[PDB]
Amino acid sequence: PELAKLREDKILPVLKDLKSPDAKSRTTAAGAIANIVQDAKCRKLLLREQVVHIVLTETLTDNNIDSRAAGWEILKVLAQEEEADFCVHLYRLDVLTAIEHAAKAVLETLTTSEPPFSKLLKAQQRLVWDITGSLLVLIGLLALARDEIHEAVATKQTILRLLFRLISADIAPQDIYEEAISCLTTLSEDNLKVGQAITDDQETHVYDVLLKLATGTDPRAVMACGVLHNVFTSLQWMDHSPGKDGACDAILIPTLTRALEHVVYANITLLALVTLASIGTDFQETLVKGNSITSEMQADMERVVGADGTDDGDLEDLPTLRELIQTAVPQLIRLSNLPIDSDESLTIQSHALSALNNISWTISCLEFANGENANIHNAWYPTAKKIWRKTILPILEADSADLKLATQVTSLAWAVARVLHGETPTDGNPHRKFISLYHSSKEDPFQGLGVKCIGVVGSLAHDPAPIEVNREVGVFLVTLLRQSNNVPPAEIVEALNQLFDIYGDEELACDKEVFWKDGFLKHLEEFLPKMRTLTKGIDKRTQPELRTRADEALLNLGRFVQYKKKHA
């Protein structure tokens, strides 16, 4: 159209000037082109004008460093403004090769002892840094875009070597250093070849560098932690099977926590929180694979340490978990609490939440029935309680603001409830707040809030809950059942299972005082057929999980109504 006409008028010459086999005319022309190329609407023309090809084809191979550097900046800018597909296209022309070469050249420049780098002209080295910058960025976006690219990149050895070279020597600008650190973080995440590349590097020993960094007082320690964490988990350096020098995941948690101590750089904060949350899901992996004052007065004081102890633990085999609990969760709570004043700490709260959510859901998945995992239960129970009161009421007492935050704190409350089980504190009658939330909030199948409210509520209603609390809640669930006409099936499975977990023991006061007194078993015999219909009305192929779930629910319901009779 017309807009395009004015655009081509502006643009076309510049390309022709770059196109100029006046490689210096284009040192100045290409040098111009990145500035020219920032514009959004205009770019789509530029792209359609086949710039990508020209640059890739010509500019990068020129003998003048200003050419290549202008050209690598062109690509960078492009990939940034544009969308992921773009990078995937670059990967198709194997820009990777072009980069590998580029990085070899930077690497020879740094590591060289003949010129050598440090004695280079001021703008000389500034040019290298400019080139490195674009190179880094590209690898970032390319790795991120797709998996098969993330692999392809963690295969080009020269690339890794360069990233190590920088991170290790720390003689480049902080914007560049930090960019390198990031780039390694992406590549190192849930990837093995990179995990090993960093550990197995004896050339610069980039590992020991990171360790030191994430260990000490350096302002950048957190970033180091992000990488190192990715590594530990990538090669499974965990509690049950530590790395060299017992490098478990645990050792990071102090520095992360100290990064939290100060908030009352800003990016540094968010990052640490994010790490801690990942540590949460990843010690899931730990637990899966696992299965006149002195002297002897102190000695004795270790006699009372049997009681769950603040300072150190029974948990010699699980330092990760104790560090989380002992150190991390204090600060996680405080941050979950403190004021909602800006949107920045709104984010920080949503994070600290996500973290506690993670940890708590991980642990809550274990077995604790009878004396199972007693030690773990004994360390967690206190903390689960503290979390409950300290962070779950206040946000519920506020009735303040957000919806998705409600999902957050609801999901969390579910986790805590899964562990606490009727031993869970009752103040301001929270089960009513949640029930209200269920009705007022009236995708993936089981992400819906109704489910999460069914869950937490049916959890806190176990024996020995206040018999009245028990009553109202059981009532709400059975209510759901009678009027199951519009309730999503997921919520049926959760409701069924909730009641099954609450009223399976006749020896419980609520069995008689509530279940029998209000004659639930009638309503159950009422729903048995309804359940069978909705069950058969579910697609075992799209999707099977829900179907099989309901099936077992019907069996146990089917079984349990039958059982329910067994006892009058």
Partner: peptide
């Protein structure tokens, strides 16, 4: 009472807030 379930950890596995990498503007 008694009950039947399987592979539960998988079920609730999903809820862990999950993260992967990736923005800012204005200069």
């Amino acid at each position: 009472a008694f009950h039947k379930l399987v592979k539960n950890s998988a079920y609730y596995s999903r809820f862990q807030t999950k993260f992967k990498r990736r923005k800012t503007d204005y200069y």
